[PDB]
Structure 1
C-alpha cells in the first residue's frame, strides 16, 4: 500500500489500539486518585477568588450600557439579563420551611449552620424578596442597575468600623451588620439612589457564610438595586460602584475586584 503489507498494517493497528487503550486507562486512573483527594463540600484552594468580585445584571457590551429612551428595542437587550436574574428571586421559588427560612427584615449578624458537613440536610438559606428592591419592564429612562457580591464558601464579609474617616462619612453607618456600596464618578452630574434589604445601601450579613452548592442549593445571595435618575443626557458617564470592607480589596488589572465599571449613556 503506502507503507506496509496488510499483515503489517494489522499489527500496527492491534498495537496502537492496546497501547492507546492502556494510556486512556492510566490517564483515567490518575484522574480517579485526584478526585479521591478532594472534598465534595469545599474546594482545596480559595486564594484565587479571595477578594470577592462585584458583578451586575445589565450585560455590558464593554463595561457599558448605552441606549435611547425614545426607542423601545434600544434597552430590551439589558432588560433580558435584568429579568434573568430577578426571575430567580420569585416568591413561588421560596416556598415552605424547606429549604428556606424567614430572616430578620433588618440587617443582622452572621448565621452558622455548623460545619461544611453532610451531618445535616440542606443548610437552610435566608429568604430574599425582590420586593425589597423598590422602584425595580424596568427603567426605560435612567436605568435601575442591580449589584451582587460573588459567592465564596465560608466567606464572612466584614464591614469597616467607624474608627476613623470614611467616604460616606458616618451616614446611616450600620457599622455592625452592613457591607456598604457607594457609587461615584468632580463629574458629579447624576443622582444616586440605592435600594436593598432593610432599606440600607449594603448587603445583610445574615446571608453568610455561604455553604456551597452541594450543601446549599436554591440558596439566595443578597442584591442591591441602584438607580441613576441623573438629570443629564447624551454623554458617556463613567460610574464606579465600590464596596467597602475588611475582606474587600481591589486591583488595577481586575476592574471587577469588589467594584463596578459602568458607562451609562441615555442618548435620547
Structure 2
C-alpha cells in the first residue's frame, strides 16, 4: 500500500518527473513573491517608527526594581566559608560593575562629572538628532560605600553580612518624581527628599521583619536612592555606554541558617506597583546565610 515508489508512467513519490519541476518552480516563484512582499511590508513598517523614540511606552509605565545577583528564584543561599558556594553571585556582581570602573569612564567627550551631591534633573535638549551624541554622567563605584567594587577590598561582599545593590529600570524620557507632603510610609531614613528617588527595604511579615536585624544603605553622597541628575534617558542610540544610578543595601544583623524574605519598595509619585508583577516598583529577595 506504500509502493508509490515507481510506476510505468515515471512516477516518484506519487507524480512524474516533469510534474515535480513544474510544482517546485511554481512554489519557488510563489514563495519568493510572498517573501519579497512580507519584506516589503516590514520595510515600510521600519520606516514608520523613529530611531530616537519608541512609538509606545505605556507598557512600561511603572519602572521595575532589579538587583545585581540575578538569582534563579531571587534567593541568595550560600556558605560564609566555602568560596565556591557564592561564586555565582560575585561573578555576576563583578561583571555588572565592570563598566563602572574609573578606567572604563575615562573619555571626557562622552562623560560628564555630575557632582558629589544629588542635584536636579539634567535635560539635554530634545530627543531629536539635531544635537550631537549626548553626555552621560559618571557614577564611580566609590559612591556605594562598603559594597564598592575592586578598589581596596574586593571582599566579594560575602564573608558574612552580604550586599545586594538595587537598580532602577532604565526608561527613555522617564523623569522620576519623588514623594511629598502626603507621607504615610516615607520614613525618616534620610533627609534628602527633593533630588533623589527614595528606596526602602523591609521584611514581608511579622517574622521576616524581626529576623532581619539591621540594614545599611549606600548611595550618591550617602542617600538611599537614585539622584535626579542622571535622568531622563535618551535611548541607546543617542546615549551609548550610559550608566544608570545604583544604590547598595547591606544586611548586617541577619539570622544565619534562616531563609528570610525582604521587600525593597521604591517610593515615588511616578512609581507604580502591581499585585501581579512583584518587580514593578517593589523588589523581593530570599536571603539565607547558612553556615
- Which residue does 1:127 correspond to in 2? 138
Distance 2:47 2:17 in 1: 45
Distance 1:168 1:159 in 2: 10
- State the Cα deviation string for residues 163-197 of structure 1 (Å, max 9, x = none): 13343434423221010010000332221100011
What does residue range 113-262 of structure 1 map to in structure 2 within 5 Å?
Answer: 113-136=124-147, 137-140=155-158, 141-161=160-180, 163-185=181-203, 186=206, 187-189=209-211, 190-262=213-285
Aligned partner (choices 69, 73, 93) of residue 62 of structure 1: 73
Distance 2:235 2:183 in 1: 35
RMSD (Å), alpha carbons: 1.2
- SS in structure 1 at match of 2:238: coil
8 A contact 2:61–2:272 mirrored in 1 = no
Which entry has the higher C-alpha Rg, 1 or 2?
2
Distance 2:245 2:267 in 1: 16
What does residue range 73-112 of structure 1 map to in structure 2 within 5 Å?
Answer: 73-112=84-123
- State the Cα deviation string for residues 99-145 of structure 1 (Å, max 9, x = none): 00011211110011111111111100111001111111422211111
CA shift for structure 1 position 70: 2.3
- SS in structure 1 at match of 2:229: helix
Q: Is the counterpart of residue 14 in structure 1 residue 25 in structure 2?
A: yes
CA shift for structure 1 position 96: 3.1
Distance 2:40 2:19 in 1: 31
Q: Structure 1-normalised TM-score? A: 0.96
Q: Structure 2-normalised TM-score? A: 0.89
- SS in structure 1 at match of 2:288: strand
Gaps of 5+ in 2: 1-11, 148-154
- Which residue does 1:5 correspond to in 2? 16
8 A contact 2:190–2:224 mirrored in 1 = no
Aligned residues between the structures: 267
- State the Cα deviation string for residues 190-225 of structure 1 (Å, max 9, x = none): 211000111100100000000010010011100001
- SS in structure 2 at match of 1:12: helix
- SS in structure 2 at match of 1:91: coil
Distance 2:64 2:143 in 1: 23
Gaps of 5+ in 1: none
Distance 1:61 1:31 in 2: 37
